[PDB]
């Protein structure tokens, strides 16, 4: 049974913590951050690290995102500044590792609204660019959840 | 409002509490970190 | 008797530099039993 450590960032609520929560407790509305999966057969515990929109630097802060073995980019499919910002995610994390190649996964959040502002096309353009995977997900419906950190953990172990 | 500090989980915890109470630390350090 | 050393949680009272370093202690002793 292998630890895996996984970070979820992205703009001010893209749902992160709705995600999280669907992840490990199995609801929406509108404390645990660890759980127990069996991923392609292999048991695995993920402890979950869910951060705050606004940023604000401190060392103590990057020394917690630092303990991240993978991160989930969140945006939601419906904010394209926050879309637009998920640069600004990446080249954060790949400066708290200090590192070019850091497992990571694009997260389109907020599928379930029809009203989207970020085409499927776009992000999946911006992840093949990063050379990352790109998962589409609802926190509302569960579509895409299990799925993306799943895929995170999958990434993890291309390492 | 505010983040709920995880209560020590006790000298006699088992490994698997203290790895709940482990991960719930993480994100209550990152919260109050200022 | 002893393998890797189990930190103790350092109280309900704690500072949060206190529980910095239980954090990173504890992280350390669950990896080392692993
Ligand atoms: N329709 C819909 N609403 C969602 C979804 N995920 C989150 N929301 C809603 O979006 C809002 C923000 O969600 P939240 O989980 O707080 O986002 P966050 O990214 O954690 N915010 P913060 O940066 O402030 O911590 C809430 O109203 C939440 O219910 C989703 O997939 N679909
Ligand atoms: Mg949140």
Same mark, same amino acid.
């Given at each position: 049974?292998?630890?895996?450590?996984?970070?979820?960032?992205?703009?001010?609520?893209?749902?992160?913590?709705?995600?999280?929560?669907? %992840?490990?407790?199995?609801?929406?509305?509108?404390?645990?951050?660890?759980? !127990?999966?069996?991923?392609?057969?292999?048991?695995?515990? %993920?402890?979950?690290?869910?951060?705050?929109?606004?940023?604000?630097?401190?060392?103590? =802060?990057? !020394?917690?995102? =630092?303990?991240?073995?993978? $991160?989930?980019?969140? $945006?939601?499919?419906?904010?394209?500044?926050?879309?637009?910002?998920?640069?600004?995610?990446?080249?954060?994390?790949?400066?708290?590792?200090?590192?070019?190649?850091?497992?990571?996964?694009?997260?389109?959040?907020?599928?379930?609204?029809?009203?989207?502002?970020?085409?499927?096309?776009?992000? !999946?353009?911006?992840?093949?660019?990063?050379?990352?995977? $790109?998962?589409?997900?609802?926190?509302?419906?569960? !579509?895409?959840?299990?799925?993306? $950190?799943?895929? %995170?953990? =999958?990434?993890? =172990?291309?390492? | 409002?505010? +983040?709920?500090? +995880?209560?020590? +989980?006790?000298?006699?915890?088992?490994?698997?509490?203290?790895?709940?109470?482990?991960?719930?630390?993480?994100?209550?350090?990152?919260?109050?970190?200022? | 008797?002893?393998? &890797?050393?189990? &930190?103790?949680? &350092?109280?309900?009272?704690?500072?949060?530099?206190?529980?910095? #370093?239980?954090?990173?202690?504890?992280?350390?002793?669950? #990896? #080392?039993? #692993?």
């Amino acid at each position: 049974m292998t630890e895996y450590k996984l970070v979820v960032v992205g703009a001010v609520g893209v749902g992160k913590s709705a995600l999280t929560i669907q %992840l490990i407790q199995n609801h929406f509305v509108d404390d645990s951050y660890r759980k !127990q999966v069996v991923i392609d057969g292999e048991t695995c515990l %993920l402890d979950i690290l869910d951060t705050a929109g606004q940023e604000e630097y401190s060392a103590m =802060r990057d !020394q917690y995102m =630092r303990t991240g073995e993978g $991160f989930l980019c969140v $945006f939601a499919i419906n904010n394209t500044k926050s879309f637009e910002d998920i640069h600004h995610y990446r080249e954060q994390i790949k400066r708290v590792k200090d590192s070019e190649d850091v497992p990571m996964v694009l997260v389109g959040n907020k599928c379930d609204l029809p009203s989207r502002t970020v085409d499927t096309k776009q992000a !999946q353009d911006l992840a093949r660019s990063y050379g990352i995977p $790109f998962i589409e997900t609802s926190a509302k419906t569960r !579509q895409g959840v299990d799925d993306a $950190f799943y895929t %995170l953990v =999958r990434e993890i =172990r291309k390492h | 409002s505010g +983040p709920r500090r +995880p209560r020590x +989980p006790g000298d006699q915890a088992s490994l698997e509490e203290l790895h709940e109470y482990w991960a719930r630390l993480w994100n209550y350090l990152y919260r109050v970190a200022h | 008797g002893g393998g &890797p050393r189990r &930190p103790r949680x &350092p109280g309900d009272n704690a500072s949060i530099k206190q529980l910095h #370093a239980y954090w990173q202690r504890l992280y350390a002793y669950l #990896a #080392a039993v #692993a």
